Design a protein around this ligand. Structure first.
Ligand SMILES: [K+]
Ligand SMILES: [K+]
Ligand SMILES: [K+]
Ligand SMILES: [K+]
Ligand SMILES: [K+]
Ligand SMILES: [K+]
Ligand SMILES: [K+]
Ligand SMILES: [K+]
Ligand SMILES: [Mg+2]
Ligand SMILES: [Mg+2]
Ligand SMILES: [Mg+2]
Ligand SMILES: [Mg+2]
Ligand SMILES: [Mg+2]
Ligand SMILES: [Mg+2]
Ligand SMILES: [Mg+2]
Ligand SMILES: [Mg+2]
Ligand SMILES: [Mg+2]
Ligand SMILES: [Mg+2]
Ligand SMILES: [Mg+2]
Ligand SMILES: [Mg+2]
Ligand SMILES: [Mg+2]
Ligand SMILES: [Mg+2]
Ligand SMILES: [Mg+2]
Ligand SMILES: [Mg+2]
Ligand SMILES: [Mg+2]
Ligand SMILES: [Mg+2]
Ligand SMILES: [Mg+2]
Ligand SMILES: [Mg+2]
Ligand SMILES: [Mg+2]
Ligand SMILES: [Mg+2]
Ligand SMILES: [Mg+2]
Ligand SMILES: [Mg+2]
Ligand SMILES: [Mg+2]
Ligand SMILES: [Mg+2]
Ligand SMILES: [Mg+2]
Ligand SMILES: [Mg+2]
Ligand SMILES: [Mg+2]
Ligand SMILES: [Mg+2]
Ligand SMILES: [Mg+2]
Ligand SMILES: [Mg+2]
Ligand SMILES: [Mg+2]
Ligand SMILES: [Mg+2]
Ligand SMILES: [Mg+2]
Ligand SMILES: [Mg+2]
Ligand SMILES: [Mg+2]
Ligand SMILES: [Mg+2]
Ligand SMILES: [Mg+2]
Ligand SMILES: [Mg+2]
Ligand SMILES: [Mg+2]
Ligand SMILES: [Mg+2]
Ligand SMILES: [Mg+2]
Ligand SMILES: [Mg+2]
Ligand SMILES: [Mg+2]
Ligand SMILES: [Mg+2]
Ligand SMILES: [Mg+2]
Ligand SMILES: [Mg+2]
Ligand SMILES: [Mg+2]
Ligand SMILES: [Mg+2]
Ligand SMILES: [Mg+2]
Ligand SMILES: [Mg+2]
Ligand SMILES: [Mg+2]
Ligand SMILES: [Mg+2]
Ligand SMILES: [Mg+2]
Ligand SMILES: [Mg+2]
Ligand SMILES: [Mg+2]
Ligand SMILES: [Mg+2]
Ligand SMILES: [Mg+2]
Ligand SMILES: [Mg+2]
Ligand SMILES: [Mg+2]
Ligand SMILES: [Mg+2]
Ligand SMILES: [Mg+2]
Ligand SMILES: [Mg+2]
Ligand SMILES: [Mg+2]
Ligand SMILES: [Zn+2]
Lengths: 234, 150, 208, 138
RNA sequence: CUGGUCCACCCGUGACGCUGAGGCGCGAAAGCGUGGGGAGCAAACCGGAUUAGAUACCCGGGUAGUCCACGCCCUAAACGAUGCGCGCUAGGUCUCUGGGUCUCCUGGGGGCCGAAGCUAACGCGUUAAGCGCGCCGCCUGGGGAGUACGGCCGCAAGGC
RNA sequence: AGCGCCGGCCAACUCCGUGCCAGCAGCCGCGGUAAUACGGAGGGCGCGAGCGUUACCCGGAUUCACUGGGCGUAAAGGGCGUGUAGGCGGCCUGGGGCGUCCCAUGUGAAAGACCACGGCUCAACCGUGGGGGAGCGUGGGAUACGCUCAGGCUAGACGG
């Protein structure tokens, strides 16, 4: 787990509309874009990953949040590659904040998987074999990665704070630590363990999330090979 | 463990064809009389449910009041909206000199001697909230010390 | 004239048994014993959550009624209490406990306070020898409260002073059941007394 | 034109702190400098230093705050919660040693200007002197 | 013929500054006085319709006036309904006008959206309603009443 | 042994009688056949040789805000400018010491008030003793800030 010359991808992103609060993490403007200072990208990674090993080799349940379609897959990949849950489609308001309720959907999903593999699949008209067929299907477009959580995450790994602002707002609210790869357009002060980098561009997100998931197993001791998502980077 | 003092209950009204449609609001204070208090404002179709809802909300939203022999570490004034609250420390024997709203929050916080004054709008709801903030803002010498060191 | 009228009814309005009769209030009959609800036609009906005020009023009315003192006198003592140094609450109690009529009762010379009062008005009481018929007379520390020589043979005196044999008495007081003498050792501590009264509310009642 | 340079400084400080600046300059004056000494020693500001800006004498005031916080709004607590000007031009305010105020049961201070120099309410009380009650800070 | 003002140079004076009771001047429209001038428009007014009536709205006419010169009048939702000056506290975006090494920096204006913050909300937010200091003006429940009386001003109407 | 209360504020509730009547009412409001609000009764609360009413003062009232308020839309920015008095005034040094601050000292009647003991059996009432200083005069002292006089400075203002 490590890397320096990473200008191979991240560094510098977003045009000029920024957020001054993210100026410490900025090196200079070029062609109208802000070029993130990787030196600090490093500093934070260290401090951040250090937080990862910490919760990792300890039983720490991390929740991954990435809705930005520019990284929807890169999320579930590196997420499933760990007992770590994730939200891929759309972050439902109250998942963390109203967890006990948003949970009954998970308690309903699993149960609607029973009927569809029992002596009751063919019972009652299609008036249900359709209503329940869709219910179960939607309950899965969303709760595939959220399915795992038994209790609030020990931390939150967000891809774009500004986009996933609603999740972050809930983390903070619940004193749940907030980890996130944040871009030039976000507010750092809201992220507890920041990874100042290019929050857009699959090649970037994959590199960070990947190494971060490496470190996660390589922290809980499981010796695993490279990432299976380096392909979805095409 | 935790005491429950109901500051006030009200029956607001909304409008639909046909007529009025009542709802109830409840302000409930919760405290251990030993430095811990919480405020709760819950609204619901029936009073009972409202109160409970309030109590429940009161338990989240707690404040750690730094009592010093029944009194506050120092005087403070806080404005919540148009309501202002003045809290002044006092020696023993003084008692809790305050309006019903403040005292209820003060006694359950385990305050036994204090000088109080309600200024501006005396809207109970806001006067109560001004109070919580006041307490929440209280600082201890150790605290000030911690801050001033560095 | 300090009240004077149906007394085991005040016990009922305060929902607590007050000893305004001494005995009778010990034998199943202070009324509080099976009939603890307020006096009047509505006594048994369910009560409504009293106003912070009501609560404070009844508390003062309790403490005040215990010593059968007037509002006029009760207030004057409390104002005196405020002014004095030290916790008003206790100090107040200390003063109420220093009334000769009360002390007579404390020493057992009488069964109740209303009796103790009359014993004073009629000269059956002595402070350091000299007669004193002022029930509000304030007994100071070191004073010797006895029975008038001429009254030591009274029927009622013997009865009460007899029942006082073996009986213990206030840690701030001392009774020499022999010559029927007693000594006010010191002002009682709040800890010394145990009245069913939260003096804190009383102070609040007057703070309004 | 500045009608009250001290009030100006006090605010510059109040303003900078509310947005968490590092330092913040204020046109220099011995008297302002004097107050900064107190402010520093008392531990409200990390410290201050003379500095020339555009050729003109200023005073970088390095502010200090508390630690990052939990939940929503992690913004640190202020070390200087309150800093208000008392005596002002056209309404000057003086006090005898016997009238020096006790700012927040001592958890705070009051900077007075006495003929024995600028002192905290405690310092003044000690040397037994009073003067112009400049401001209060806590 | 003449006022204000912005920018660049950093050249001259050396705190000569800010505000400002009273004073003085300016002050939309209507209105007044004297003399002009009147195309169009149009209070009053003369008629035609409408209407239950229609001292209105719609239609045909039409005088003062609207325009000019001199004096007067001194009011307004005279409004940003936000007194003036200075210092301080993210940014984005559009625009007018200077200078620059003319990606875009800089200065002075005009708009919009917004950090912090403020506000009863609505909203305000470097063009503050933010954080501050200075000075002026003004408020203190509604009606009676901007009335009465008095004073001052005005030809009057009326104004303060 | 009385007097006033028992709709909310505000401690205390039932029956009957009266019906928008007769009446109550500090404020909000009660009474047009089931009135805890009128009148009576029973009951209850409060106080007690007194209890209520009226009037008047301070309080609550930061409701004129010194402590301690406001003026965009709630009452409130003068229609605008010019400018008199006045209020307010950047950076450095020096003299003075008026403001301001410190020390002594005089004055500050007695009574009253406060604390402590006492005298009338208590108390009210009274006596003795004890601190308590603000204000002003005098005499010393300090000089940071304000003031004033001198001399400097360019970052305000003005000029080229
Ligand atoms: K506030
Ligand atoms: K708001
Ligand atoms: K007139
Ligand atoms: K009837
Ligand atoms: K009745
Ligand atoms: K009054
Ligand atoms: K106006
Ligand atoms: K000098
Ligand atoms: Mg959704
Ligand atoms: Mg982005
Ligand atoms: Mg409500
Ligand atoms: Mg604390
Ligand atoms: Mg406070
Ligand atoms: Mg306010
Ligand atoms: Mg008010
Ligand atoms: Mg006392
Ligand atoms: Mg200031
Ligand atoms: Mg401040
Ligand atoms: Mg002041
Ligand atoms: Mg003051
Ligand atoms: Mg020109
Ligand atoms: Mg020059
Ligand atoms: Mg020169
Ligand atoms: Mg001017
Ligand atoms: Mg001038
Ligand atoms: Mg005009
Ligand atoms: Mg005209
Ligand atoms: Mg004309
Ligand atoms: Mg003409
Ligand atoms: Mg025409
Ligand atoms: Mg008609
Ligand atoms: Mg007609
Ligand atoms: Mg016409
Ligand atoms: Mg306008
Ligand atoms: Mg702009
Ligand atoms: Mg501009
Ligand atoms: Mg511009
Ligand atoms: Mg905001
Ligand atoms: Mg509102
Ligand atoms: Mg709203
Ligand atoms: Mg805006
Ligand atoms: Mg400003
Ligand atoms: Mg405003
Ligand atoms: Mg003005
Ligand atoms: Mg006026
Ligand atoms: Mg009036
Ligand atoms: Mg009027
Ligand atoms: Mg008029
Ligand atoms: Mg005239
Ligand atoms: Mg005339
Ligand atoms: Mg007129
Ligand atoms: Mg009641
Ligand atoms: Mg009836
Ligand atoms: Mg009544
Ligand atoms: Mg009497
Ligand atoms: Mg009072
Ligand atoms: Mg007042
Ligand atoms: Mg008034
Ligand atoms: Mg004021
Ligand atoms: Mg007001
Ligand atoms: Mg209006
Ligand atoms: Mg208005
Ligand atoms: Mg204006
Ligand atoms: Mg000066
Ligand atoms: Mg001057
Ligand atoms: Mg000098
Ligand atoms: Mg002097
Ligand atoms: Mg003297
Ligand atoms: Mg005297
Ligand atoms: Mg005596
Ligand atoms: Mg004396
Ligand atoms: Mg000198
Ligand atoms: Mg001064
Ligand atoms: Zn009894």
């Amino acid at each position: 787990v490590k890397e320096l010359l990473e200008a191979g991808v991240h560094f510098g992103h977003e045009r000029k509309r920024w957020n001054p609060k993210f100026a410490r993490y900025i090196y200079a403007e070029r062609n109208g874009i802000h070029i993130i200072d990787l030196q600090k990208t490093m500093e934070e990674l260290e401090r951040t990953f250090r937080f990862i090993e910490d919760l990792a080799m300890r039983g720490g349940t991390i929740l991954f949040v990435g809705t930005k379609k520019q990284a929807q897959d890169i999320v579930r990949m590196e997420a499933e590659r760990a007992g770590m849950p994730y939200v891929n489609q759309r972050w439902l308001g109250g998942m963390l904040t109203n967890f006990k309720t948003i949970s009954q959907r998970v308690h309903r999903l699993e149960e609607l998987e029973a009927l569809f593999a029992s002596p009751e699949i063919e019972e009652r008209p299609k008036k249900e074999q359709v209503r329940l067929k869709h219910e179960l299907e939607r309950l899965q477009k969303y709760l595939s990665g959220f399915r795992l959580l038994k209790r609030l995450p020990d931390a939150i790994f967000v891809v774009d704070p500004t986009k996933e602002a609603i999740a972050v707002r809930e983390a903070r609210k619940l004193f749940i630590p907030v980890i996130a790869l944040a871009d030039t357009d976000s507010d750092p002060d809201l992220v507890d363990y920041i990874i100042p980098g290019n929050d857009d561009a699959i090649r970037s997100i994959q590199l960070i999330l990947s190494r971060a998931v490496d470190l996660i197993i390589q922290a809980r001791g499981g010796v695993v090979e490279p990432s299976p998502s380096y392909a979805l980077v095409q | 463990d935790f005491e429950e003092k109901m500051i006030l209950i009200r029956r607001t009204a909304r409008m639909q064809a046909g007529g009025r449609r009542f709802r109830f609001g409840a302000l409930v204070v919760v405290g251990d009389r030993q430095g811990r208090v919480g405020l709760g404002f819950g609204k619901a179709p029936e009073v009972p449910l409202a109160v409970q809802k309030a109590g429940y909300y009161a338990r989240r939203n707690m404040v750690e009041v730094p009592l010093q022999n029944g009194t506050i570490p120092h005087e403070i004034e806080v404005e919540f909206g148009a309501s202002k609250i003045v809290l002044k420390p006092a020696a023993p024997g003084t008692g809790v000199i305050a309006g019903a709203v403040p005292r209820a929050i003060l006694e359950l916080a385990g305050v036994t001697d204090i000088l109080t004054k309600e200024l501006g709008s005396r809207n109970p709801i806001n006067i109560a909230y001004a109070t919580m903030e006041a307490l929440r803002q209280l600082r201890t010498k150790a605290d000030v010390e911690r801050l001033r060191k560095g | 004239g300090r009240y004077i009228g149906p007394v085991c009814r005040l016990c009922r309005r305060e929902g607590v048994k007050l000893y305004l009769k001494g005995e009778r209030c010990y034998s199943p009959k202070c009324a509080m014993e099976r009939r603890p609800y307020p006096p009047g036609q509505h006594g048994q009906k369910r009560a409504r959550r009293p106003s912070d005020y009501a609560v404070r009023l009844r508390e003062k009315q309790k403490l005040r009624r215990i010593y059968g003192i007037s509002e006029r006198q009760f207030r004057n003592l409390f104002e005196e209490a405020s002014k004095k140094k030290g916790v008003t609450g206790s100090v107040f109690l200390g003063l109420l406990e220093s009334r000769l009529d009360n002390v007579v009762y404390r020493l057992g010379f009488a069964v109740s306070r209303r009796q103790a009062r009359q014993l004073v008005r009629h000269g059956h009481i002595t402070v350091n020898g000299r007669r004193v018929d002022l029930p509000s007379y304030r007994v100071r520390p070191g004073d010797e409260i006895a029975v008038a020589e001429k009254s030591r043979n009274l029927e009622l005196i013997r009865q009460n002073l007899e029942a006082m044999k073996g009986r213990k008495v206030g840690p701030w007081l001392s009774l020499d059941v022999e010559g029927m003498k007693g000594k006010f050792l010191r002002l009682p501590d709040r800890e010394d007394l145990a009245l069913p009264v939260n003096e804190q509310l009383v102070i609040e009642f007057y703070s309004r | 034109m500045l009608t009250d340079p001290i009030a100006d400084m006090l605010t510059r400080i109040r303003n900078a702190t509310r947005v968490y600046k590092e330092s913040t300059d204020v046109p220099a004056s011995r008297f302002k400098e004097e107050i900064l000494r107190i402010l520093a020693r008392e531990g409200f500001i990390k410290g201050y230093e003379r500095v020339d800006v555009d050729g003109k004498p200023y005073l970088r005031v390095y502010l200090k705050y508390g630690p990052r916080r939990q939940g929503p709004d992690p913004r640190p607590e202020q070390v200087i919660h309150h800093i208000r000007r008392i005596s002002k031009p056209g309404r000057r305010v003086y006090v005898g040693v016997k009238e020096i105020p006790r700012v927040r049961r001592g958890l705070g201070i009051a900077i007075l200007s006495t003929s024995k120099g600028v002192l905290t309410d405690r310092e003044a009380r000690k040397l037994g002197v009073g003067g112009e009650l400049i401001c209060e800070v806590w």
